[PDB]
């Protein structure tokens, strides 16, 4: 049975280099090229390159040319990957793979039946940044005896996560805290909303409690109707 066993996950800072290993067994190691594929959530799987144990011949993906190195150790039958000048875009799970068809005479490289378990690599700054909390006012419309919507926008924080409660957890019904989104600036942001009766806007006080443990930040924000 063909097996590929990869080394443990790791955390890195931008500027660092990284090395991961892929130990193979269950077949003639020198006959088959080994590939490296990385996966990040929301993005295409990205082929980094292949490496042939015979001679250590390599072919790197154009967009990684210069920053990637693929080697191997014949005796321990272990393939190695190195990636230099790490940035946030290198955050991913890294896999070594091998094609389904491989004999002593021939191979087809691209039908990846054999995968290692994968090696999680996170690249991020050690810096933290607390959120800015802006109110999403209930607006001066939406019926008189119906339901109004309100919330707060939790913008430009790093890293994940933030949590939001309302009125110290006393308010839970109709509350929706959305999954955060990553902005172009590299900072996160999310919204938390709650639907309440419109007739309670002039009586009940609504406060969102924003928690951000990495920056040691706890912020309360009162969301009230705009005065005009």
């Amino acid at each position: 049975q063909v097996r590929l066993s990869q080394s443990g996950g790791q955390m890195k800072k931008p500027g660092d280099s990284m090395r991961i290993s892929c130990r193979a067994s269950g077949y003639e190691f020198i006959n088959c090229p080994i590939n490296w594929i990385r996966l990040a959530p929301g993005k295409r799987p990205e082929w980094m390159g292949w490496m042939k144990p015979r001679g250590g011949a390599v072919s790197y993906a154009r967009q990684l040319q210069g920053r990637v190195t693929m080697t191997r150790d014949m005796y321990s039958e272990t393939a190695f990957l190195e990636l230099r000048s790490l940035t946030s875009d290198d955050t991913a799970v890294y896999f070594c793979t091998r094609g389904k068809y491989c004999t002593a005479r021939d191979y087809y490289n691209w039908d990846f039946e054999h995968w290692g378990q994968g090696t999680p690599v996170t690249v991020s700054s050690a810096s933290t940044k607390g959120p800015s909390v802006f109110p999403l006012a209930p607006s001066s419309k939406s019926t008189s005896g119906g339901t109004a919507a309100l919330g707060c926008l939790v913008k430009d924080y790093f890293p994940e996560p933030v949590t939001v409660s309302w009125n110290s957890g006393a308010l839970t019904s109709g509350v929706h805290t959305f999954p955060a989104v990553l902005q172009s600036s590299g900072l996160y942001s999310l919204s938390s909303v709650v639907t309440v009766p419109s007739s309670s806007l002039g009586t009940q006080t609504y406060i969102c409690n924003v928690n951000h443990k990495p920056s040691n930040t706890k912020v309360d924000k009162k969301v009230e109707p705009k005065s005009c």
Binding site: R44, Y108, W110, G118, L136, H176, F178, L190, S191
Partner: protein, 208 residues
């Protein structure tokens, strides 16, 4: 070179997933399955040949440059993300997630102007809320003085609610303070099966 569609399928156990991939070049195409927290697995290679262990519920087809993976009678272990592949090229992926069925429900739409506190900074965020709708499929379009917006918006969607089985979506339009004060009508347009016609929520900058 590899265009995979759709982005997301929200289906119930027993239904069929139809996943397509359009290529600009012919040659052996493969399909992969990635379960949550697990390495991807080869499902199909060479267009329609099943890998070992793969049940006949999975099948591959091709019409012209369009390749299709169909998954009939969806089981628990079938849900996850699927990728098509040609040589070193992969598709964007298709997320197949579990959807619990209920009656169609139109979203309640709310639009939120930028706060005055935020406008002091230099950027303006316009938030549009789509609350408690079903099914998941919904389109949001931003209009500024009746001009379609693209490239300046981000969306986020909640998991299907464990009580009422609805979804909620949030879309944020981001502009500079200067650009925000250049226009009057800020509108956000929602299209959903539960609405007889597209619904638009808007506000005029300056007036309450």
């Amino acid at each position: 070179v590899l265009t995979q569609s759709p982005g997301t399928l929200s289906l119930s156990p027993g239904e069929t997933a139809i996943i397509s991939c359009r290529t600009s070049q012919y040659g052996s195409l493969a399909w992969y399955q990635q379960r949550p927290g697990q390495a991807p697995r080869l499902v199909i290679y060479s267009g329609s040949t099943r890998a070992a262990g793969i049940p006949d519920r999975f099948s591959g087809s091709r019409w012209g440059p369009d390749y299709t993976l169909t998954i009939s009678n969806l089981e628990s272990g079938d849900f996850g993300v699927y990728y098509c592949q040609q040589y070193e090229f992969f598709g964007q992926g298709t997320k197949v997630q579990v959807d619990i069925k209920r009656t169609v429900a139109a979203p309640s739409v709310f639009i939120f102007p930028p706060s005055d506190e935020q406008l002091k900074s230099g950027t303006a965020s316009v938030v549009c809320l789509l609350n408690n709708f079903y099914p998941r499929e919904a389109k949001v379009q931003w209009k500024v003085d009746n001009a379609l917006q693209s490239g300046n918006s981000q969306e986020s969607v909640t998991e299907q609610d464990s009580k009422d089985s609805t979804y909620s979506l949030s879309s944020t339009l981001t502009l500079s303070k200067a650009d925000y004060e250049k226009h009057k009508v800020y509108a956000c347009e929602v299209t959903h099966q539960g609405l007889s016609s597209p619904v638009t929520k808007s506000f005029n900058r300056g007036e309450c």
